[PDB]
Design a protein around this ligand. Sequence first.
Ligand SMILES: NC(=O)C1=CN([C@@H]2O[C@H](COP(=O)(O)OP(=O)(O)OC[C@H]3O[C@@H](n4cnc5c(N)ncnc54)[C@H](OP(=O)(O)O)[C@@H]3O)[C@@H](O)[C@H]2O)C=CC1
Ligand SMILES: CC1(C)N=C(N)N=C(N)N1OCCCOc1cc(Cl)c(Cl)cc1Cl
Length: 218
Amino acid sequence: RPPLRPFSVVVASDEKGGIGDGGTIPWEIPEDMQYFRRVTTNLRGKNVKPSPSKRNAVVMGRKTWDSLPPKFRPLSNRLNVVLSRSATKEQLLAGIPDPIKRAEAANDVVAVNGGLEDALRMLVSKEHTSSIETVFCIGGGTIYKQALCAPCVNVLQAIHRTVVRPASNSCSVFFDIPAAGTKTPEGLELVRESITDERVSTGAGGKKYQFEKLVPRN
Ligand SMILES: NC(=O)C1=CN([C@@H]2O[C@H](COP(=O)(O)OP(=O)(O)OC[C@H]3O[C@@H](n4cnc5c(N)ncnc54)[C@H](OP(=O)(O)O)[C@@H]3O)[C@@H](O)[C@H]2O)C=CC1
Ligand SMILES: CC1(C)N=C(N)N=C(N)N1OCCCOc1cc(Cl)c(Cl)cc1Cl
């Protein structure tokens, strides 16, 4: 069976696993926004600037793409891989209000009529193996779930999770991660590799957050 491209998950969720209200993210944590940008944009080695020749790819569901404000659509300096059963590349670009930016964005957007697995099969192509350094799954609910299920979970390299507290009173969409010291029936157990001390966001509500990195146990 054609092998799947390895990948990492980047997500922000509260203790109840909440990640959103169905349409957007309920909290304002600029520190996470900035960290997310750096983590998904940065290329390894010294002074390697992202370009179509080599850059990371961010895989997201169509609803997550729609959730991106104009200033973040597409996510610059990264290949935007959008999963949709109906929306084509042109249709995804059609929603970008600035016509010149929309023209410039054509080079950074690819539509996949399939789920995460389909995206990973595609990112394994010799073209992408060279031009795409790291693949980051960035949501939302439907995509995160596929990430922790076979066969995708078998090539999951790490989870960069921003833990948010206190729990949101607006979350209806979740990301179910197995608790520490627990192994899912499917066979996945995560181990903390690192975690920052809790900090208070300068954002509205002053949410308390931590940047945690988890990896599958082997
Ligand atoms: N806290 C966090 O870190 C993050 C939170 N979010 C939030 O989560 C919510 C969105 O999550 P969610 O509702 O799950 O939507 P998703 O972002 O997961 O997108 C789901 C959509 O993607 C496409 N899709 C999913 N699986 C397949 C498949 N197998 N084949 C083809 N297309 C597929 C389909 O779009 P189509 O309808 O076009 O067919 C589907 O409706 C929002 O509240 C958002 O703000 C999003 C990212 C990160
Ligand atoms: C949650 C966020 C950023 N943080 C971490 N750690 N991990 C993620 N996967 N993230 O979401 C990526 C896709 C949605 O991005 C946005 C959504 C909104 Cl609503 C706005 Cl205003 C700006 C951006 Cl870039």
